[PDB]
């Protein structure tokens, strides 16, 4: 059925949905602790999303380092309202749905099984199609 058979499951999926929410902030210590676990990391600490009054990173900002290459993908979150795409705020979602990935960087949206699971055109499927199979294997390991 030309769709992935391996995805992100169980508590890894639950925690990635709780981890890419809009209000998730990380200090330098926990950011360093997480970056210790990227195999594909290039060793450069990203500029924090907030510099004052305290250097705080964001869950999406950390996740964008996991995403391989320059991958472009657009999905919708599991609880994305239908009426939002009609009125204003179409490209600035009040509820932080409408997952958008540009240049392999997560711009907005909350990741759920609709984007990380085994569905046609999901993020892992795009990664497998664009990059090889080795890079997608690394993607899986780093996410977990």
């Amino acid at each position: 059925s030309n769709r992935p058979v391996m995805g992100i499951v169980q508590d890894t999926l639950t925690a990635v949905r709780k981890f890419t929410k809009r209000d998730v902030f990380l200090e330098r210590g926990e950011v360093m602790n997480l970056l210790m676990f990227l195999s594909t990391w290039d060793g450069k600490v990203p500029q924090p999303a907030i510099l004052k009054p305290r250097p705080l990173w964001t869950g999406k900002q950390i996740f964008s380092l996991i995403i391989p290459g320059h991958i472009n993908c657009i999905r919708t979150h599991s609880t994305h309202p239908d009426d939002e795409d009609s009125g204003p705020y179409k490209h600035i979602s009040p509820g932080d749905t409408k997952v958008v990935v540009e240049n392999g960087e997560l711009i907005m949206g909350i990741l759920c099984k609709k984007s990380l699971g085994t569905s046609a055109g999901s993020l892992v499927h795009i990664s497998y199609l664009e990059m090889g199979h080795d890079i997608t294997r690394l993607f899986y390991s780093n996410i977990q």
Binding site: H70, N72, I126
Partner: peptide, 17 residues
């Protein structure tokens, strides 16, 4: 429809590259 090459995504890739 189901087709080999995802033309729109490759156009997006070309735009971003």
């Amino acid at each position: 429809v189901v087709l080999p090459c995802n033309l729109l995504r490759m156009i997006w890739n070309a735009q971003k590259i």
